[PDB]
Structure 1
Amino acid sequence: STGFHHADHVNYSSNLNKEEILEQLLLSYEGLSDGQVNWVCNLSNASSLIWHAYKSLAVDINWAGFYVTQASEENTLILGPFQGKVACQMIQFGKGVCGTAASTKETQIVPDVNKYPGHIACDGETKSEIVVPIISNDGKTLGVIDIDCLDYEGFDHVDKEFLEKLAKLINKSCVF
């Protein structure tokens, strides 16, 4: 027996830098998602990883999780696993930050959500947000990775660059 528990993946002593923490996240995700293709399992655990990483980073986040492209309908996101407070159930493609990322297939970084026309506030206290789409082999949107922050200007390119890797990893480790 290793002495490790599954939960030990979210121990990031605060002395580590941003690069180390996020690189650890990606490695934790591989190890956790290796055993199964089940997307509910992999994203649930992924949400925990994202949440604790950012808390460890001293980013005042209030949401960390996913929306997934609905089975029957190609243009609707349905709420998936997440860490944080009760969230919006369904989001059309093209609508708000999440639907915008879904439609453009491109990452969205928003410094002030109240200044973002069309913003879908699931938590009224959210001031900033990043959304990164999860792209299939055939280039289609499978879902989005979404993070909310209680401060303005919470996310930048480092978050985008890392979350784009996590998405590729998810596509490769999950059957949607």
Structure 2
Amino acid sequence: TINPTNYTLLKKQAASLIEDEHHMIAILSNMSALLNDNLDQINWVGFYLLEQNELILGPFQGHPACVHIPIGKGVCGTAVSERRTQVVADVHQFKGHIACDANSKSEIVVPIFKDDKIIGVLDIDAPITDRFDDNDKEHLEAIVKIIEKQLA
């Protein structure tokens, strides 16, 4: 069972942990908390930032994670190489998954852009398969857009 999220109100809340703020790490840290507090059936939510051509672990809510993820590898790395959101129903069956993806049963990764350049990703993992659907995708991408506008 997955309790629904009121994404409509969540987007307004997100605007508050983003508005008037210009310290990116602080924005990402608070956003990881906001999402964790409002998404049921997830075991990890956070960000990875693109640096020196590889994803580097950023703020998150959950257990310790891998720090380095190569572009094109893993669910997160594939989101960057594909330059599009990845909605994975079964990570174990995801072509390109890596050991670092081990504790994720299903997952959604949204690329974050700035000046047409991917600067990182929003990554949300779940302890069960098929956690995310098209609706979750639409609302989470909208929330990422709010983050992008603030970082722009």
Q: TM-score, normalised by structure 2?
A: 0.91
TM-superposed deviation, 1:123: 5.9
Asked if 1:90 is matched to 2:72, the reply is no
Residues 79-126 of structure 1 show CA distances to partners (whole Å, capped at 9, x for unaligned) of 010001101101111111101111221010111111113213436332
Give 1:63's aligned amino acid: W
Q: 1-side partners of 2:31 and 2:98: how far apart?
A: 23
Contact 1:87–1:123 at 8 Å: present in 2 too? no
1:23 aligns with 2:4: no
Task: Verify: 1:67 aligned to 2:44, yes or no.
Answer: no
Q: For the residues of structure 2 that align with 1:107 and 1:113, how far apart are their CA atoms? A: 14
Partner of 2:142: 165
Structure number with greater Rg is 1
Unmatched 5+ stretches in structure 1? 1-13
Whole-angstrom CA distance in 2 between matches of 1:104 and 1:140: 13
| Distance in 1 (alpha carbons) for counterparts of 2:88 and 2:142 | 20
Counterparts of 2:8 and 2:119 in 1: how far apart (Å)? 23
Q: TM-score, normalised by structure 1?
A: 0.79
How many residue pairs align between the two structures? 150
Residue 155 of structure 1, CA deviation: 0.5
Offset from partner CA, 1:43-68 (integer Å, 9 cap, x none): 1111011111112xxxx211011101
2:95 aligned partner: 117
Q: RMSD of the TM alignment (CA)?
A: 1.6
User: Is the 1:85–1:123 contact (alpha carbons within 8 Å) kept by the matching residues of 2?
Assistant: no
Give the equivalent residue in structure 1 for 2:59. 81
Greater share of residues in strand: 2
Structure 2 alignment gaps of length 5 or more: none
% identical aligned pairs: 47
